[PDB]
Design a protein around this motif. Structure first.
Motif, PDB file in Angstrom:
ATOM      1  N   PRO A 249       0.803  -1.232   0.000  1.00  0.00           N
ATOM      2  CA  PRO A 249       0.000   0.000   0.000  1.00  0.00           C
ATOM      3  C   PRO A 249       0.830   1.273   0.000  1.00  0.00           C
ATOM      4  O   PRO A 249       0.300   2.329  -0.364  1.00  0.00           O
ATOM      5  N   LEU A 250       2.111   1.222   0.389  1.00  0.00           N
ATOM      6  CA  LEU A 250       2.965   2.399   0.247  1.00  0.00           C
ATOM      7  C   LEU A 250       3.314   2.654  -1.216  1.00  0.00           C
ATOM      8  O   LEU A 250       3.366   3.807  -1.658  1.00  0.00           O
ATOM      9  N   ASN A 251       3.530   1.588  -1.987  1.00  0.00           N
ATOM     10  CA  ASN A 251       3.990   1.729  -3.361  1.00  0.00           C
ATOM     11  C   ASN A 251       2.857   1.884  -4.360  1.00  0.00           C
ATOM     12  O   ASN A 251       3.096   2.371  -5.472  1.00  0.00           O
ATOM     13  N   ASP A 252       1.636   1.486  -4.000  1.00  0.00           N
ATOM     14  CA  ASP A 252       0.539   1.386  -4.962  1.00  0.00           C
ATOM     15  C   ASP A 252      -0.764   1.797  -4.289  1.00  0.00           C
ATOM     16  O   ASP A 252      -1.272   1.083  -3.416  1.00  0.00           O
TER      17      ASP A 252
ATOM     18  N   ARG B 284      -5.330   6.703   2.689  1.00  0.00           N
ATOM     19  CA  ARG B 284      -4.113   5.900   2.589  1.00  0.00           C
ATOM     20  C   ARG B 284      -2.989   6.469   3.456  1.00  0.00           C
ATOM     21  O   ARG B 284      -2.272   5.709   4.120  1.00  0.00           O
ATOM     22  N   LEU B 288      -1.147   4.305   6.501  1.00  0.00           N
ATOM     23  CA  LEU B 288       0.301   4.106   6.550  1.00  0.00           C
ATOM     24  C   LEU B 288       0.952   4.690   7.801  1.00  0.00           C
ATOM     25  O   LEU B 288       2.168   4.518   7.976  1.00  0.00           O
TER      26      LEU B 288
END
Lengths: 369, 370
Positions: A249-252, B284, B288
């Motif tokens: 989820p950090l990259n995409d 998001r 994170l």
């Protein structure tokens, strides 16, 4: 081994003043009816449930009915003493499960040869109660030793006690409510909106093969979480190895966290045999609910003659304990014989479905005599 | 009054390792920067917020900034003593608000002449912090007397204290958290799903006048309720004349209860100047989030040197008090100078945005301790 049964009515008038033709609902029963038919306990089921409160239909069922821990020989709801009966609601969520029989949006309209969809009449908790009443009357029964249910089942139970005061001797409400207050009615609306947003919903007219599966799964993701607790999710995350800075989820932006993937897959698995329109109709039934379906909760409580037992779950985030306290206090102030005890586990709302045996003794004591 | 300002960075590196060109964010400040630049208090804003923490841009603004009750001359955050500064985040929810300036999916990519949409790089709380840090450096500031924020702002504040320990003397977290735990990350996901279900979303590539308006409205309905309480909804229902057996929803599956009509209208009013993709990116960023953006909360708390104050709301159903208790106890177990006090009002999460002055004295004495 439990035999699934079917009850049929050629004509039925809803609480909203509409006709349903050729009602069919499933039911089942455990134990033996006594000669006076005075030992009947009706179990009323929760939002995503069915009549399958106990036992197995086949030896190879992976699990028995949802309240098997307290329904059986010598158990808190003792089938050596009671005839324990349960009925599928109208618009049952599990519309495509072969063990469920229901009537609702998925039923075929004879005048069209297609599902009713959102042409089906609005249903209420009272309609479920009245179908149950018609079945009981067809069996020669005119009184209930007790009516018992969790969540949406607690709504049916307390409506029974208010609507038909002479029918009900005892009423047990688990993880329950005396009404859908404004908070609860708004909360349930969020279960409905994802289905209405799914491009396949087609305003309710979808075919089974092009169903709004993504919207239905989204609804079940929210239902699943609402009915649990932070403790449950965080322990689940620990097993998954969840952390905040996960690479996917950090990259995409289109990939998700581990816990989200787990919840999505859990919801998809729960929803396999469910119907989206039926979910919308059960939401609406719950939103219209107040015990007795009169002008307000106080009026409905004033009609109850049964002694009452309330069993909220302390950690319930869905039907919070104050809803049970509200009904219990109202009844106490009217000199009703009312008792409240609490489930204290960490599964939240789901304590009342999966762990009700934690208050088995309160139930057993309530049913004695 | 307050003047809205703009800060520009020609090139910016994200925590995820990507480049954003032509970053622009709005900002504003109250009070006077002293000669040592030693009196700077940074306010970091909540999920649906902006830099507009206090005051008015125009006298006839219907309301001042969201924390006007505690920012001003003689107030809990005293602008006669402190220079109080606040910065719009990247991907600010209020993408079409005339005062907010942000960079995110709605921005024009200079390389294409067209909006980024979901080509915009994933952003984090750390990216918001790093934009703030660059602005502060451009002003010659090298230390923060305090960093203070509610909710998503508390995430920025505690990440500041962990990532740049010598920069931060004091950290106030309101209605806050030290991490988005598994529960919170799953809870926030439900804010995103209605948008992605709406056919108009078009995998992020929608035009402004063809936006997923009904998905965004559904998201804002859930956000609005998650941040309040049964008490608030039931009092609202009483004002609306809410009844259980309302004739319209009984007669028609497509009609709604009074309280639902109210919530839908409130949501659509809130969403008038918002963008759906920006909401997805803020979800998001929050998912994170852990203080310090290491592998767990303990590692992030270990680098905090600032003294800390936590102000959860007892009735918060969104960032529940246990999140503040967890971070506070982690800090006291490390011998950090940490204090926790609680807002006791019945508005839930919104206590920290609309009623923070209920703990004004705790904030004032935390900041004024010479």
């Amino acid at each position: 081994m439990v035999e699934k049964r079917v009850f049929e009515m050629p004509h039925f008038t809803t609480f909203g003043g509409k006709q349903i033709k050729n009602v069919k609902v499933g039911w089942e029963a455990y134990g033996t009816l006594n000669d006076a038919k005075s030992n009947v306990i009706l179990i009323t089921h929760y939002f995503s449930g069915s009549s399958h409160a106990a036992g197995k239909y086949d030896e190879n069922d992976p699990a028995p009915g949802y309240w098997d821990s307290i329904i059986g020989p010598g158990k808190a709801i003792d089938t050596d003493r009671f005839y324990v009966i349960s009925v599928d609601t109208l618009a049952n969520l599990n519309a495509y499960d072969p063990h469920v029989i229901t009537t609702g949006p998925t039923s075929i309209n004879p005048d069209t040869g297609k599902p009713y969809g959102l042409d089906f009449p609005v249903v209420t908790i009272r309609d479920f109660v009245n179908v149950q009443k018609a079945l009981l009357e067809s069996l020669g029964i005119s009184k209930l030793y007790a009516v018992i249910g969790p969540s949406m089942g607690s709504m049916q139970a307390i409506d029974w006690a208010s609507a038909y005061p002479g029918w009900v001797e005892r009423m047990i409400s688990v993880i329950g409510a005396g009404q859908s207050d404004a908070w609860t009615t708004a909360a349930l609306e969020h279960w409905a909106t994802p289905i209405t947003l799914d491009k396949n919903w087609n305003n309710g007219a979808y075919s089974k093969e092009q169903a709004p599966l993504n919207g239905l799964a989204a609804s079940l993701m929210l239902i699943t979480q609402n009915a649990l607790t932070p403790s449950f999710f965080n322990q689940t995350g620990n097993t998954l190895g969840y952390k905040n800075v996960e690479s996917a989820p950090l990259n995409d932006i289109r990939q998700s966290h581990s816990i989200v993937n787990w919840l999505r897959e859990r919801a998809k698995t729960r929803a396999k045999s469910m119907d989206a329109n039926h979910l919308l109709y059960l939401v609406r039934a719950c939103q219209l609910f107040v015990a007795g379906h009169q002008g307000n909760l106080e009026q409905g409580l004033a009609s109850i003659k049964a002694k009452t037992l309330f069993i909220p779950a302390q950690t319930d985030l869905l039907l919070m304990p104050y809803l049970s306290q509200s009904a219990h206090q109202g009844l106490t102030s009217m000199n009703n014989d009312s008792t409240l005890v609490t489930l204290n586990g960490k599964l939240g709302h789901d304590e009342g479905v999966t762990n009700v045996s934690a208050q088995a003794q309160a139930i057993r004591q309530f049913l004695e005599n």
